Structure formats: C-alpha cells, structure tokens
C-alpha cells in the first residue's frame, strides 16, 4: 500500500547517498596508505632490533664453534663402554625412527632408516658425547634465518619502493574536500587516465610481496632428523652422561664450556626466530592491506563511471513490504528492493527500528544495497 510518489521520494533520497559513498571511498584508499606506511615503519624498526639482535646471536655462535674445535683437537673416547654402547644407541635410534615415519609421516620408512644407519656409522659417540647434532642444528638453523631474512627483506624493499613511488601521488595527499559535509565531492577531472598507473603499480607491490607435520618435512629432507629421539632410546642417552672427568679432565672442561656457550646460542637464536616471525606478519599485513587498496581502487571507479550519467536514478526504490505484505518476511523487519544502477534489483532488509519514521531509513538501505553492489563484482 506504498504510494508510489513516496517510492520516489525514497529513491531521491537514497540517490544522494551514492554521492557520499565516493567520498567515503577515497578516504577508504587515504586510510589504508596510512595503515601501510604505518606498517612500514614498524618494518624499519623491527629491522633495526634484527640488527641488533644478529650481533648477540653471531658472537654467541662464534665462541660456541671456538668451543667445539678446541673438543676435537681432544677427539678420543675417554671410556670404552662408550664404544659398546653405541653400537646398541644405534640400531635404536633406526627404529624409533622408522617407526614414527611410517604411523606419523608416510611411505618411506625404510629409506629413512637406511639413510640414517649409513649417516651413524660415519659418525662416532664421541660427537654424541659432545652433543654434536644439537651445534650443527644450530649453525643451520643459524643460516636458514639469514636467508629467510635476506629473501624476506629484498621481497619488502622492492615492494616498499614501488609503493612509495604510487604514494607520492597528490591523489593521496588529504584535502578538505574529503571532509565537505554540505558542498559535494569530485574525483580528479582525468581519474580514468590515473587508474590504470596506479593499479598496476599496486599488482606490482603484490608480485614482490608474495613468497607435527614439521618434524616429517625434516626426516625427509635429512634422516639426521631422526637425532631428535635421542631421548627414546636407552644407550644413547648413557653416552651423553658419560663422566670423562676422572679419565681426560680437559675433555670434560672444553665439553662443559661448549654446552655454556651452546644454551646462551640457542637462547639468542630462538630470540631472533621470534623477530623474524614478526617480521613476517608485517609481510603478511602489507599483502593484505595491498589487497584492500586493490579493491577499494576498483571500487571507487567503478562508483565513478557509474555516476557520470544524472539522467536517471542511481538507486530507484521498486518495492516495500513487511510480514504483513508477504509474511515470508521475517516479523521484525522490512524488505525494500533497490535498481541500484539499473543493475539486477537488490533487496535490502532493515529492523523495523531504522524503517518506521526514520530519517536514517534510506541511509541505511543505500548503505546496504551498495555494500551488496560491491560484493557482485
Ligand atoms: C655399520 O657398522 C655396523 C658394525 O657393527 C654394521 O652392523 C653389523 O653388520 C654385520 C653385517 O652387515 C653384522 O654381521 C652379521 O651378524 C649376524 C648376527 O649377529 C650374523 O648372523 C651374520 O652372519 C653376520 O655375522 C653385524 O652383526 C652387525 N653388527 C651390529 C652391531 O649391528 C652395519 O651394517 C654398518 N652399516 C652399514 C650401512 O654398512
Ligand atoms: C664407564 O661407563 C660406565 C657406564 O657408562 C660406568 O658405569 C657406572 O659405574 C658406576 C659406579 O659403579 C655406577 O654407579 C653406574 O650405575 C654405572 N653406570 C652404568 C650405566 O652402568 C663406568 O664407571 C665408566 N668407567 C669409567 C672408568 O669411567
Ligand atoms: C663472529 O663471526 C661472524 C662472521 O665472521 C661476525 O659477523 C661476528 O662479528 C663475529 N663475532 C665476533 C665476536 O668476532
Ligand atoms: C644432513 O646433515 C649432515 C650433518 O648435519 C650433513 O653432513 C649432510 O650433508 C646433510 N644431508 C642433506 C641431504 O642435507
Ligand atoms: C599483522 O601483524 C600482527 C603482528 O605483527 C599479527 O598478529 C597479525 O596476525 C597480522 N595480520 C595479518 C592479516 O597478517
Ligand atoms: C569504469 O568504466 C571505464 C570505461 O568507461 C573502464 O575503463 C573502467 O575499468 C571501469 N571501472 C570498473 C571498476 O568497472
């Protein structure tokens, strides 16, 4: 029982939200380069702890492998049990870790095996006794962090670049026109000679940006791996409490100093992994907020060429029904239906609170309608 000439009131009105939404798009776009180039200073900073925090972890390295060479200038077995039990450690660890491939992991479980039993007989106990595996899983783990952030660090740089290259555009510099509450908005007079430059740039920044189940990862690359079970099995751990310190007294200083320096490494080392895990959601959060600026770019000239034409409504109101009307409608609402473009007609639902004699009604249904506009492309 809606009066028509009432209809086009409400499409009068809701045509006049079309015109803020342009307006809040820009800002939307000025909000977001805000929002990246916060991050990138919180990049910058988070690179200078790294910095500081690579110092701490290489010295701490270097005189733990000044340790480990002045324990091998001593190589020898101090007991001979050592001997004997670690052709009993390793037919265990073999196993321990065969059998946690095959139920955990996958197929392979032999090849494993094999590859670690050829690894074991050219090594000695006296590199367990040492606690060998756990320093060259360090300086590894030591070199991985310095590549991921030689990789993640160039990936950043070059996108950093080709945004603050898109930024320096006076497109994005604040203007009062951005918070007009009664004069209207105006795009730039050659924004479609402007869209193409910048969205290219920002795929550009998007290309540059873009780079236990662990523990299987691992076992298949190297079945040194496997060396994490050292505790499962018996014999191997009784290598690692050998006392030399009645037999080679110098052995058992270096060997004490060694695991000093190893626990203060490895200390620094797991400190720096968590820098870097920062440093990567800084990586992820500029890939995600590249990606709003990408849709919020599209979304304001998609608004723009849409609205150069005045001869006929943006958003033309068709119907409006209750549960009375159509009683498929769910009680405490209404559902108007909106040509929002002349495009496939949209139906908005609003609260009976924002419908009956509200003059936020069709703020709210343009609100609406544009928001499931957007969505479509
Ligand atoms: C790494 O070195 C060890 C040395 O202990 C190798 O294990 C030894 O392998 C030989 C032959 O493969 C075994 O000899 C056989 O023993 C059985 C039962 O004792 C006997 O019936 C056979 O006639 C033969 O004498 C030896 O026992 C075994 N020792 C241990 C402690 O396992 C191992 O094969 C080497 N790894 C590689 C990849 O070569
Ligand atoms: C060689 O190693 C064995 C074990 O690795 C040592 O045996 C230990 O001896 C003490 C003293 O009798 C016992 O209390 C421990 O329980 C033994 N340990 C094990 C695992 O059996 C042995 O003392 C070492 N020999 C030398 C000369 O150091
Ligand atoms: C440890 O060696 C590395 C590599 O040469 C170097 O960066 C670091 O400064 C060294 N630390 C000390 C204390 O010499
Ligand atoms: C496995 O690790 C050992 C020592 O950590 C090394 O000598 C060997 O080359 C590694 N193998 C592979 C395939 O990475
Ligand atoms: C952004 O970074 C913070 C911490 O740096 C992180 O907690 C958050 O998950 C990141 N967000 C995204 C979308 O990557
Ligand atoms: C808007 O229309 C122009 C052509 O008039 C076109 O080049 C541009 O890609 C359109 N933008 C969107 C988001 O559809």
Same mark, same amino acid.
């Given at each position: 029982t809606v009066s028509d000439n009432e209809?086009? #009131?409400? =499409?009068?009105q809701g045509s006049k939200y079309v015109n803020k939404e342009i307006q809040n798009a820009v800002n939307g776009v000025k909000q977001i380069k805000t929002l990246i180039e916060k +991050?990138? #200073? #919180?990049?910058? +900073? &988070? &690179?200078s702890n790294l910095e500081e925090a690579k110092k701490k972890k290489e010295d701490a390295l270097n005189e733990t492998r000044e340790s480990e060479t002045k324990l091998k200038e001593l190589?020898?077995?101090?007991? #001979? +049990?050592?001997?004997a039990l670690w052709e009993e450690c390793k037919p265990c660890l073999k196993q321990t870790c065969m059998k946690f491939y095959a139920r955990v992991c996958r197929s392979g479980s032999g090849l494993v095996g094999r590859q670690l039993e050829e690894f074991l007989n050219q090594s000695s106990p006296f590199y367990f006794w040492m606690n060998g595996d756990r320093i060259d899983s360090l300086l590894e783990n030591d070199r991985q962090q310095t590549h991921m952030l030689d990789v993640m660090q160039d990936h950043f740089s070059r996108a950093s670049s080709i945004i603050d290259e898109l930024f320096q555009d006076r497109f994005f510099t604040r203007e009062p026109q951005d918070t007009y509450h009664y004069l209207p908005f105006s795009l730039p007079h050659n924004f479609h000679a402007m869209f193409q430059p910048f969205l290219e740039m920002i795929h550009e920044a998007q290309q540059?940006?873009?780079?236990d189940r662990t523990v299987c990862r691992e076992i298949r690359h190297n079945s040194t791996g496997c060396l994490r079970m050292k505790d499962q099995c018996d014999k191997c751990r009784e290598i690692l409490s050998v006392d030399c310190s009645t037999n080679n007294p110098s052995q058992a200083k270096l060997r004490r100093e060694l695991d000093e320096s190893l626990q203060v490494a490895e200390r620094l080392t797991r400190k720096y992994n968590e820098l870097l895990k920062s440093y990567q959601w800084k990586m992820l959060n500029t890939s995600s907020l590249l990606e709003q600026l990408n849709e919020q770019f599209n979304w304001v000239s998609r608004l723009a060429n849409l609205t150069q034409g005045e001869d006929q409504y943006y958003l033309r109101v068709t119907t409006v029904a209750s549960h009375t009307s159509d009683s498929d409608v769910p009680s405490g609402v209404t559902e108007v239906v909106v040509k929002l473009f002349? =495009?496939?007609?949209?139906?908005? +639902?609003?609260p009976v609170e924002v419908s009956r004699k509200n003059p936020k009604f069709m703020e709210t249904v343009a609100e609406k309608a544009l928001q499931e506009y957007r969505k479509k492309h």
């Open positions: 209809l086009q #009131e409400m =499409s009068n +991050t990138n #200073e #919180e990049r910058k +900073t &988070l &690179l190589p020898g077995v101090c007991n #001979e +049990t050592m001997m540059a940006m873009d780079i002349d =495009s496939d007609p949209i139906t908005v +639902t609003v």
